[PDB]
Design a protein around this motif. Structure first.
Motif, mmCIF file in Angstrom:
data_model
loop_
_atom_site.group_PDB
_atom_site.id
_atom_site.type_symbol
_atom_site.label_atom_id
_atom_site.label_comp_id
_atom_site.label_asym_id
_atom_site.label_seq_id
_atom_site.Cartn_x
_atom_site.Cartn_y
_atom_site.Cartn_z
ATOM 1 N N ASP A 6 73.601 22.665 -34.151
ATOM 2 C CA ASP A 6 74.527 21.913 -35.003
ATOM 3 C C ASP A 6 75.828 22.630 -35.371
ATOM 4 O OD1 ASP A 6 73.250 19.224 -35.765
ATOM 5 O OD2 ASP A 6 71.590 20.642 -36.024
ATOM 6 N N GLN A 10 80.619 23.624 -34.023
ATOM 7 C CA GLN A 10 81.608 23.242 -35.026
ATOM 8 C C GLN A 10 82.674 24.309 -35.170
ATOM 9 O OE1 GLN A 10 80.389 19.913 -35.256
ATOM 10 N NE2 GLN A 10 81.465 20.183 -37.208
ATOM 11 N N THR A 72 77.500 28.428 -43.225
ATOM 12 C CA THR A 72 76.097 27.999 -43.370
ATOM 13 C C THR A 72 75.533 27.486 -42.042
ATOM 14 N N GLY A 78 61.869 30.435 -45.557
ATOM 15 C CA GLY A 78 62.619 29.287 -46.038
ATOM 16 C C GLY A 78 63.817 29.739 -46.844
ATOM 17 N N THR A 80 68.221 30.621 -46.557
ATOM 18 C CA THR A 80 69.374 30.026 -45.859
ATOM 19 C C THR A 80 70.065 31.027 -44.925
ATOM 20 O OG1 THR A 80 71.070 30.567 -47.527
ATOM 21 C CG2 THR A 80 69.793 28.512 -47.848
ATOM 22 N N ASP B 6 64.014 24.827 -52.893
ATOM 23 C CA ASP B 6 64.909 25.766 -52.209
ATOM 24 C C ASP B 6 66.393 25.367 -52.175
ATOM 25 O OD1 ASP B 6 62.978 27.767 -51.644
ATOM 26 O OD2 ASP B 6 62.420 26.865 -49.730
ATOM 27 N N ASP B 65 79.093 15.731 -38.923
ATOM 28 C CA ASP B 65 78.601 16.985 -38.353
ATOM 29 C C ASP B 65 79.225 18.247 -38.973
ATOM 30 N N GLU B 66 80.337 18.101 -39.695
ATOM 31 C CA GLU B 66 80.920 19.219 -40.436
ATOM 32 C C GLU B 66 80.257 19.443 -41.803
ATOM 33 N N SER B 68 76.579 19.041 -42.460
ATOM 34 C CA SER B 68 75.135 19.283 -42.461
ATOM 35 C C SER B 68 74.750 20.453 -43.375
ATOM 36 C CB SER B 68 74.645 19.546 -41.046
ATOM 37 O OG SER B 68 74.921 18.425 -40.230
ATOM 38 N N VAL B 69 75.724 21.315 -43.676
ATOM 39 C CA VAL B 69 75.560 22.436 -44.612
ATOM 40 C C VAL B 69 75.129 21.986 -46.010
#
Lengths: 435, 435
Positions: A6, A10, A72, A78, A80, B6, B65-66, B68-69
């Motif tokens: 993903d 980008q 990110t 779990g 980030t 989380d 798509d920019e 998803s973070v």
């Protein structure tokens, strides 16, 4: 175990913004620290050849909040996962590792005989070429991760070393670097170099002089205040300095003009044919005129244009020895190719503006062309004059060799432009007609 | 069944960043669509009362798509789950439900007698309060999904509904809301309002007029072009309009001045004592002078200052009926408290500048003070004049009641400032001395 898919699409160093990437997972992971992991990712696309990108991945938390989107990466069972080029504690440690100068497992770090700039504040830098992402420590040193790994060596480090140990002034002094022997070959992963804070690109500086004549024009190319001629001359002896210095350590050889090789270039260029086929016999006549003639080949830049040249106070700097088949990139060549590149770039600087001054239509763009031809031919003269003032040899003195490489750089320019941008085509075609 | 713990501490609308949480699980879920689900999540800490946050969750693919973070919540076997606010087709629905105006299971979406603005391009606003997130459909309307749910009635909505149905031109017309009756008490989950495009704050507009006199000063407060007096007068009748209209529907009552209540305020203020203790007997003499006297109490704004007032073309707008103990916030009060708030705000606008003009030192700040006192007292006059021009009653006519609330607003201002910012303390103390 993190779905890069993903965000590895980008980024703006990712090439295949058009390519259709099927799954793209890791191909290596050295644990630099408990937090970090130098992950080299392999990118398989349907209908293409696999590409390999690198990323120093951090876990835990990846601030600032001013950088979440860009950095990110995904959930990581779990915690980030982001990328450490945006974590000032994690960049400090990469830079310390390059000063140790250590070797964590496979990734081997190495510093020159200098003094690096740690315990200094690091942010990322935003002119992110598809080659690279890069953080700058203080105003002293600029670290650069090569994003897309192709097998070492890497001229940009190879040359800046030989050129800085020789003590050439025109080079951003190299400090350290690091690589890795993935599978068979080595892979240059990054370099750190003295930071030219307060710089400006050549193209951006020529663009402002080309802006001067044209706006409030009809006043001569020499009379206007914006005159780049003086600066062009200095840039000449700058490029000539690095060339002569490079030839001292690299050495020189004699070879004949690549007639059959450069014919293959002009032949393939005719695939995307325009009126270029009409010039082709006259061009081929210029080519086969210099057949069975010997030239001198040094190690050279390979990709010189005003963009790859920076101006600091107290000197011009040459950067991005990309240069552009890594085997073919290292191969020596006539320095007449590099002066062809700069002279080629001058015409593009002057006429992008004229296209931006055809922008900017309609009645008397004929005036602008007259000024552009004036400017283009005057700074090319001033540049060649300065080059010839540094080394005894004058490039224009052996004009026929240069005129060939200028014509070749135009054929590559036509094909490289025509496919990508249709609007450019007049620039290569008209300049081909000019020469 | 997605694990929130989380990422519901990662959002920066999350309150308990310094609470230390245990099992933060879900406590409601109404399925709005096939992809969506309104989920009120309950946060159970150790050593600290529980809170409750909401989040409309979407499942499937989550783009843009920019983004998803800040979205990717978790991987619930096997489709990803993420919050819908970053999805334009999902907010289009959350709006088309408030327009329906439907009621899915527990959550009732209501709308006023207007037309909402769907099929209009929405993005989320990054000015995201620890109370909220909000999307803005076009330049037309602004949705606002409360991130933490305290039990109603959120009086900003209660006082906006009443005013807009009444057809008050001085508010941001309320378009819709939505809520749910969980456990016992009701919870207002969001609201959408008419988006005031082309607006400017009162404080920002007064700051530019206070900027005018002061820079290139010594030229009189009335003579300068920047003169705010005309605009202040209009703002007067604007605040008086909403007050009179609010009293019509809310009704009025008679009550005596809160002597013992406002004594407790001045007593607690003396805890962080300065020279305020020296004024205290003279202040208490002003307080016990109005003891056993009756006033008129309406529903009011509660927190008026130039920041909570906007200017659009063709009218002033009153916003943020916060107002500021939700029980105490809804309680009626003398409108003399609201005109005290605005007149209080005028002095702060004029003297922040004089502190920014003491910035800005050294020799003759005495000139600026002379101009500030001029400006402060003239627009206070112009404002009161305009208020009195709207309703028959003049606030300055019953001055003693107003002068009390001005003094109280200064005591709360002193304590609220002194603890947070030491540099402010001269502003409340000097203004207390002025009155």
């Amino acid at each position: 175990s993190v779905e890069f898919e993903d965000w590895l699409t980008q980024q703006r160093w990712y090439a295949g913004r058009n390519r259709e990437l099927v799954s793209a997972t890791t191909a290596m992971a050295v644990r630099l620290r408990d937090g970090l992991e130098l992950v080299l990712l392999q990118a398989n696309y349907a209908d293409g050849p696999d590409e390999r990108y690198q990323v120093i991945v951090a876990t835990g938390s990846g601030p600032i909040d001013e950088y979440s989107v860009v950095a990110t990466i995904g959930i990581a069972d779990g915690q980030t996962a982001y990328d450490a080029l945006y974590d000032p504690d994690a960049t400090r440690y990469l830079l310390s590792l390059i000063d140790e100068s250590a070797t964590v497992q496979n990734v081997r770090f190495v510093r020159e005989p200098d003094v690096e700039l740690p315990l200094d504040a690091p942010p990322r830098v935003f002119g992110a070429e598809q080659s690279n992402t890069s953080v700058v420590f203080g105003e002293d040193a600029i670290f650069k991760l090569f994003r897309r790994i192709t097998p070492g060596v890497h001229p940009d480090i190879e040359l800046n070393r030989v050129l800085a140990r020789a003590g050439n002034p025109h080079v951003a002094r190299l400090l350290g670097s690091f690589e890795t022997e993935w599978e068979g070959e080595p892979y240059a992963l990054g370099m750190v170099t003295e930071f030219a804070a307060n710089s400006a690109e050549g193209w951006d500086m020529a663009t402002t002089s080309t802006r001067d004549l044209f706006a409030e024009g009809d006043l001569y190319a020499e009379e206007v205040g914006g005159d780049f001629a003086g600066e062009a001359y200095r840039l000449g002896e700058a490029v000539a300095s690095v060339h002569a210095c490079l030839a001292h350590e690299l050495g020189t050889e004699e070879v004949p003009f690549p007639a059959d090789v450069m014919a293959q270039r002009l032949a393939a260029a005719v695939d995307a044919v325009p009126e270029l086929r009409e010039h082709v016999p006259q061009i081929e006549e210029r080519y086969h005129k210099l057949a069975d003639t010997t030239m001198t080949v040094q190690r050279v830049h390979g990709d010189l244009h005003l963009g790859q040249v920076l101006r600091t106070p107290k000197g011009w700097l040459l950067i991005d020895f990309e240069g552009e088949p890594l085997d073919e990139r290292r191969r020596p060549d006539t320095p007449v190719r590099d002066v062809a590149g700069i002279l080629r770039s001058f015409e593009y600087a002057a006429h992008q503006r004229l296209v931006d001054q055809a922008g900017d239509d309609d009645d008397r763009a004929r005036q602008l062309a007259a000024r552009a031809r004036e400017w283009v031919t005057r700074n090319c003269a001033s540049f060649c004059d300065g080059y010839a003032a540094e080394a005894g040899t004058d490039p224009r003195d052996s004009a026929d060799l240069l005129a060939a490489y200028e014509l070749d750089k135009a054929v590559y320019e036509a094909a490289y432009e025509a496919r990508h941008r249709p609007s450019w085509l007049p620039i290569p075609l008209g300049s081909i007609a000019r020469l």
